[PDB]
Design a protein around this ligand. Structure first.
Ligand SMILES: NC(=O)c1ccc[n+]([C@@H]2O[C@H](COP(=O)([O-])OP(=O)(O)OC[C@H]3O[C@@H](n4cnc5c(N)ncnc54)[C@H](O)[C@@H]3O)[C@@H](O)[C@H]2O)c1
Ligand SMILES: NC(=O)c1ccc[n+]([C@@H]2O[C@H](COP(=O)([O-])OP(=O)(O)OC[C@H]3O[C@@H](n4cnc5c(N)ncnc54)[C@H](O)[C@@H]3O)[C@@H](O)[C@H]2O)c1
Ligand SMILES: Cc1cn([C@H]2C[C@H](O)[C@@H](COP(=O)(O)OP(=O)(O)O[C@H]3O[C@H](CO)[C@@H](O)[C@H](O)[C@H]3O)O2)c(=O)[nH]c1=O
Ligand SMILES: Cc1cn([C@H]2C[C@H](O)[C@@H](COP(=O)(O)OP(=O)(O)O[C@H]3O[C@H](CO)[C@@H](O)[C@H](O)[C@H]3O)O2)c(=O)[nH]c1=O
Lengths: 361, 361
């Protein structure tokens, strides 16, 4: 099967591309604009395969995207291209509106026109898989707000949308466009929403990769507020396996939440990383001494937790890693990949760091 | 109080403007781009008031909208500007994405920067009222799908979003942006969602005004599908009164559904209009003979019904009209305003009619 993938040069996208080339018989055409987050070095292991092709383009460029669909004649689409950092969306929302909302719209239109003109056979098998986030569901009650006995709620596929930030509002909107295109034109679409991902090739602006690298460089480990906020952690390779399973066996018009059932508090995750480094790369003092409490993120969601029961009983997917096994692999990966880290950290990166952390709030 | 209103030259907007000038002590600055749907003639009774000012502009023009906010120093905002026809959104969705989503984004940003720089007093009292639709909630179970005993569900403020068309997806997205701006930056926003409006100054593309005018011209009365679909009808003047009540007494961060609790089937509404005309403007044959069944609307939602309990018990709002009293006033209004009707029906209007109705589906 020929799969057209948007955002394949990013964190989760590159994991999807590497998995398809190494473990399946499918082919791939990767469309990526290569923003600060797009890095071809993340696809080094497979860039030479004859079953892989790369196209440097913007999903907002209709004419070029149309040309690409006609040339490769994809059997399915996996849309991962997007602006993904909440902190960047707070100070610079325009890019999120343009890429996440208008960009999805532009891609849906090219796909609709393409799909409508396909032969009976290929037309019935076509699939448009939209990769999304759990953040569209809003915030959940926190352990310190309820009775130490009551069972805390989780995010399910029928939970109401209530996005808190420009980023999550962006994604929630893209989700609506995908489902409306299905109801109005008949486009066979699928939507997935998953929890926080972590692991190899993660850009150094998200919690885990930022903390690991700052620790090794002797810099502060910035905790927003008290660090009691909770997140559900899923190893990126597990997400990749689930995604290929969905685009291949998923049912048109369905939604699947993806996660690993691993609620953890931020501060706890930072301590775990510090203990791992104290063990592997010991020094005069403990890495914990670099931990610093800074001004909280505006509108910060205090707790995310996914209920992946549905995809489990319907597609039979289960994560292979545990947070414990995955977090150690992540730390080891960064220690062994300084070359990749140095190539991703540019002058632009340092500008973002100064903007978001120095003289913070 | 100085109120800045977007889309004040349209159907619902002009009703809001006329109500404020005639029945309150507030002032108004009206911003409207004057699309096919904008009509200054709908504001003839108040365009000369010194408490009213008009600005011909596009909400996407940040520089000009910024200048307008600084000149009039509004105390509140009522955002009604938008592309509102589902049928137009099916064939030309681009305009809906641009005006409804990107336009709301642009307006939210100008309002945020304006609000943040206000004095302590005026800053705490500022209000950004977003006027929206019930269609963001998706479709509801229809009487012919359930047990003739079970109570049919209604739309409440906690119903999950599930838009079916490009139009409703557009509005659902604008809703998310408004709430996220509130959670992230603290902007005091309010959101209202109401059922189908009908009454004076309604553009001839929606069911009721289209049926009334076509009947009088001896043209067909087009029924999509079987005409068994259901809608909740609210007289436009009742909506206007509710809206001024919300922007004035509504609580920041709250949502209020607005309706009249009047579920009616389309075919039944058409028969009602026909009997009213047979009575008032009798002719050789009955107007019923012009009723014609045509190809259904793609993705058509079969039933909408609002539960306005909340706004009723919290703000004390109730509709003054009944569908019976309001529908007669509507028919009488069109018979007495042929001047307005002739000015709104242009060559562009006829092009839309040919496009949507001749050789239909
Ligand atoms: N990070 C997570 O834990 C997580 C969880 C659930 C969902 N998601 C979703 O997964 C997808 C990828 O996330 P990452 O993998 O987290 O993102 P990322 O920031 O690492 O990469 C985004 C990628 O998209 C590309 N891109 C951005 N704008 C583009 C445009 N206009 N045209 C083409 N390419 C463009 C970038 O160049 C980059 O390769 C997103 O849609 C995101 O919402 C992320
Ligand atoms: N008609 C209904 O039953 C109903 C019900 C619920 C909600 N609403 C909402 O009420 C609002 C107004 O509906 P109508 O009153 O039904 O709409 P309308 O179609 O009659 O008028 C829209 C108005 O907005 C203006 N406009 C369009 N794009 C603009 C832009 N970019 N900048 C400035 N002005 C622009 C038009 O010139 C016009 O005067 C909409 O936001 C709609 O979603 C309508
Ligand atoms: C960057 C950073 C983050 N944090 C906290 C805030 C959050 O509670 C937690 C994780 O923050 P982030 O890495 O930015 O991730 P988060 O906002 O949860 O969102 C991620 O996970 C989402 C899915 O849950 C994805 O849709 C997003 O694209 C992805 O970026 O760590 C800090 O305390 N300090 C920091 O410096
Ligand atoms: C135009 C037209 C409509 N209809 C039917 C389809 C619908 O079930 C019903 C009403 O159609 P419309 O007048 O287009 O309205 P509808 O789609 O319900 O949407 C309206 O009501 C919405 C709120 O419910 C608003 O948000 C929209 O802006 C407004 O345009 O009548 C016909 O049978 N024939 C027609 O020619």
């Amino acid at each position: 099967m020929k799969i057209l993938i948007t955002g394949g040069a990013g964190f989760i996208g590159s994991a999807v591309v590497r998995h398809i080339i190494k473990n399946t018989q499918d082919t791939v055409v990767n469309i990526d604009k290569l923003t600060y987050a797009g890095n071809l070095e993340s696809l080094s292991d497979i860039s030479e395969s004859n079953r892989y092709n790369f196209e440097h383009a913007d999903i907002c460029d209709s004419a070029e995207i149309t040309r690409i669909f006609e040339q490769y004649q994809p059997d399915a689409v996996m849309h991962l291209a997007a602006e993904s950092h909440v902190d960047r969306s707070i100070t610079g929302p325009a890019a999120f509106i343009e890429t996440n909302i208008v960009g999805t719209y532009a891609l849906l239109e090219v796909a609709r026109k393409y799909w409508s003109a396909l032969g009976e056979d290929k037309k019935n098998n076509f699939r448009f898989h939209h990769i999304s986030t759990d953040e569209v569901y809003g915030d959940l009650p926190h352990p310190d707000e309820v009775e130490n006995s009551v069972t805390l709620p989780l995010f399910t596929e029928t939970t109401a949308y209530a996005p808190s930030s420009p980023y999550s509002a962006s994604k929630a909107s893209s989700d609506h466009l995908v489902r409306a295109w299905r109801r109005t034109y008949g486009l066979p679409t699928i939507v997935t929403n998953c929890s926080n991902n972590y692991g190899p090739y993660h850009f150094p602006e998200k919690l885990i990769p930022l903390v690991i690298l700052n620790a090794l460089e002797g810099k502060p480990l910035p905790i927003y507020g008290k660090g009691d906020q909770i997140r559900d952690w899923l190893y990126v390779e597990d997400h990749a396996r689930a995604l290929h399973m969905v685009v291949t066996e998923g049912k048109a018009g369905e939604t699947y939440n993806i996660g690993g059932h691993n609620e953890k508090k931020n501060l706890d995750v930072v301590f775990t990383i510090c203990d791992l480094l104290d063990e592997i790369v010991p020094k005069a003092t403990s890495y914990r001494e670099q931990i610093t409490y800074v001004a909280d993120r505006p509108g910060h969601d205090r707790r995310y937790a996914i209920d992946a029961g549905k995809i489990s009983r319907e597609l039979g997917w289960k994560p292979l890693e545990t947070f414990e096994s995955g977090i150690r692999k992540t730390v080891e990966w960064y220690l062994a990949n300084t070359q990749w880290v140095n190539n991703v950290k540019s002058g632009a990166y340092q500008s973002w760091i100064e903007q978001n952390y120095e003289g913070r709030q």
